[PDB]
Design a protein around this nucleic acid. Structure first.
Lengths: 81, 92, 109, 96, 109, 93, 81, 96
DNA sequence: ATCGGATGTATATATCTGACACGTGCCTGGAGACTAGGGAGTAATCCCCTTGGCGGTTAAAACGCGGGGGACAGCGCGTACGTGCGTTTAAGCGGTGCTAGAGCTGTCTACGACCAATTGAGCGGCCTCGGCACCGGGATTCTCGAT
DNA sequence: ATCGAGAATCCCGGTGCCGAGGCCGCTCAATTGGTCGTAGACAGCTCTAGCACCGCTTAAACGCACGTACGCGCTGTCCCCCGCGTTTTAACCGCCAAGGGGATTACTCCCTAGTCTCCAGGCACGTGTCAGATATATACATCCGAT
């Protein structure tokens, strides 16, 4: 409901940076990464809910997420389509 | 015969800035803009119709396409500008 | 027999051609069928966007002490408005130039 | 009384998390965040499990690419640490 | 009737010519669809699938696995420059990332 | 029957390229999405090609031009060769 | 047959382009790099333009072919056509 | 004799070329380069002047945007002079 | 450089287990036969836009020359981020239950495709004078070398 | 922190020129009245999967102490790019001339949409089984602290 942005823990962001090849991380990376992730998630979810509402459904299917990601150019393979 | 939106863009201009002209290059740019947004919205509406297994494009298809494409309040006014017109079209 | 002809654009209070948009939608290979209100909605949206750009273009032309609109005014209007810049962020305008912008570090101390 | 010099285990977990394909983000906090974000657009919204999984995969792919660009920008500035200015420059150049 | 032979077998392909023809006709792409267009498209799709699968099988052999997993597909795509360019804006679920560390971060002494 | 995919054809091609190698369900779904995406890309480019030239039919020439436009050079040459071989073989019989 | 026309993109032209881009100081190696990237972009556009021209069975490259190529590569030039 | 300092004339040029909307690239050398490049795709190929002008506009816009990204990358590295490494970093982050 | 302790990988082997691949029924979509009509290949023609050349102006490019300011290397500092350890939190994981609603089926009616006259909206040709480019001048503001 | 010479640029007024705007003739595509097929709107039923809840286990997050190495500031060198003057040079513009091929129309012919009948390739459904994930024991590649 509230304050779920802190659920993206600092070790999770550190693991994401390690996957990205980052060796040393400053302390301000976590808040900036949370902000960027929130912006990206809002951008995708807004269009996912738009696709859901147009179809006159109450559940957000994976197909709606795939369509939204394709509409932002982030094509995803593995979840249908 | 070459068709464009030049007369329509000029008519829209006269009701916004009644004493402002426009050059040929700017009119061509406006025609390019109108054609680009037309094909963008029509393609999005066609995709939406295909996704829902529908064989027709209705006003809510265009409305959803406008919501998907135009950002922020630029969509929020435009939807209203669309919907009012349809209502005026409905009540002849 | 037939009543006096009344165009669809004026029936919807628009300036853009509803019939032309309907014809383009029918022949544009978008769907098997086209609804009655879809061209009206699309023409209204296109006219609104045209007016929204033309207002700022005329404002920019007035700011340059000009009575006509040139591509420079369209470019300035689009790059100054945030939503218009977002909508046309991957669009190149001929003879439009660039927005004046100098980084603060390059300015003399 | 045994220690590893700084950066040795930091050099580790790069090979470890580039050899693997697991998500590295906890499922339930991300699902809660997704539901919180979605509840602003529409009230009483349900989600398929595959939808949340697709959102998670896309978000982590985007974050990993952004962190690669951030690391490149940090190296460009003759640094090893990544700073929020690096993220800002990467997002600016990417057009976001 | 002189017996039914699939157009895929007639063209020496494995991908379905009839299914591709049906999808092209029902996809609202054009008013009419030529006879050789589904054959050409099926051939191109089969060639691309063969390339992907061959490189993925090579990756699986390099990983001592007899079954192709998404990691092998991602490795095959990212290790081929033209396959990577074709699918640059594509995310592979459960695919991971290509293992690469910048030389600056490596220890120097 | 209520569902259609390319798993049969992708598996048939897999046995041709690697006779002793299998594929997982997730990888098969990724391959199906890849085939669908390439189908949409080529079909849309061919539709735009037919629109630009005031034609009403999509032919092998439009598909060939779409393949040349989309795929990179070394891959597009082989794709064009395979498509031409398929069309000639289909026309012969 | 034309040759050595990449050198016709002179150093003052690159300097003017950098000035329009907001650049105060320019290194001596910028000109060759800029010529290389301009050549790469030009072949990328012209290959698609010539493909569009050849598909139409034309021997003249019209502005519409260039516009279609640019829109295909994500440039979307306004004005011409 | 009167001589300006090394920084001011560059700023005047920046302002001058940011107010204007002209090309700043000579038309005939650019056209010759376009024909030379197109000669490698089809021989005896004729060009439309509108097509050459469109190519010039697009290439100039691309170069100007790349130069803004290059300036950003130069400033990020605590520099004023743009270097080829800045162009390379900009093209890497952009995707080219 | 070099050696030994101490980790953290690699390697070999047993042991489940649950996806993978293969058989099977069946049904719906692909293939064969046949017909009609319009899209397009093929001929022919016009004229317009492209290509090629030439002469004169001059704006732009090339080149050399100070020289000062920025790039870069080196050095010192100090603090912020790693590494490891102990403790706490909550995420998986395994059930169980309940019901919202996604998906599928059967009518049937309103909506869109289609067609046959009809005409006014919009496109093409053609003047035509006013916005804007240019010049010529003066006045104002910014920059740098001197106190 | 000021002052003045000098260059860059803004503002006012006069002259001209060509292109945006208005007007008229003329096609042809939008309107209107009408009919018919069918797409989906709606009512209804089902079954499934999404949400809520609870208990247990332990994987992981968090807090903290310590150290060290790396970001950052300062300083000195020097070299290389910028401002400016002088000398080519070829870009540009005006003008002419030939013709190649891009638009057009006419014709016809053959390729594809459409419909009927048939039948077999592909999709649920089920089931054996072994590829591989996991656990346990063993061997070595590397890291680091002295030496």
């Amino acid at each position: 409901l509230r304050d779920n942005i802190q659920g993206i823990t600092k070790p999770a962001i550190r693991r994401l940076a390690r996957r990205g090849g980052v060796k040393r991380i400053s302390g301000l990376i976590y808040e900036e990464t949370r902000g960027v992730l929130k912006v990206f998630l809002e951008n995708v979810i807004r269009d996912a809910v738009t696709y859901t509402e147009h179809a006159k459904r109450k559940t957000v299917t994976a197909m709606d997420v795939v369509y939204a990601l394709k509409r932002q150019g982030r094509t995803l393979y593995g979840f249908g389509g | 015969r070459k068709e464009s939106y030049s007369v329509y863009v000029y008519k829209v201009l006269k009701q916004v800035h009644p004493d402002t002209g426009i050059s040929s290059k700017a009119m061509g740019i406006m025609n390019s803009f109108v054609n680009d947004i037309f094909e963008r919205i029509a393609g999005e509406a066609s995709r939406l119709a295909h996704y829902n297994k529908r064989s027709t494009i209705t006003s809510r298809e265009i409305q959803t396409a406008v919501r998907l494409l135009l950002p922020g309040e630029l969509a929020k006014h435009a939807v209203s500008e669309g919907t009012k017109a349809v209502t005026k079209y409905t009540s002849s | 027999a037939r009543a006096k002809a009344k165009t669809r654009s004026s029936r919807a209070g628009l300036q853009f051609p509803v019939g032309r948009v309907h014809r383009l939608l029918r022949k544009g290979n978008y769907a098997e069928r086209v609804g009655a209100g879809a061209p009206v909605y699309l023409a209204a949206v296109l006219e609104y966007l045209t007016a929204e750009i033309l207002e700022l273009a005329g404002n920019a032309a007035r700011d340059n002490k000009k009575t006509r609109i040139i591509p420079r005014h369209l470019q300035l209007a689009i790059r100054n408005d945030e939503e218009l810049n977002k909508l046309l962020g991957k669009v190149t305008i001929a003879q439009g130039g660039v927005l004046p912008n100098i980084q603060a570090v390059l300015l003399p101390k | 009384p045994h220690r590893y010099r700084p950066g040795t285990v930091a050099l580790r977990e790069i090979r470890r998390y580039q050899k693997s394909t697991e998500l590295l983000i906890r499922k339930l906090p991300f699902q809660r965040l997704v539901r919180e974000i979605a509840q602003d657009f529409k009230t009483d919204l349900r989600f398929q499990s595959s939808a949340v999984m697709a959102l998670q995969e896309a978000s982590e792919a985007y974050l990993v690419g952004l962190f690669e660009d951030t690391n490149l920008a940090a190296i460009h500035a003759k640094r090893v640490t990544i700073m929020p200015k690096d993220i800002q420059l990467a997002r600016r150049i990417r057009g976001e």
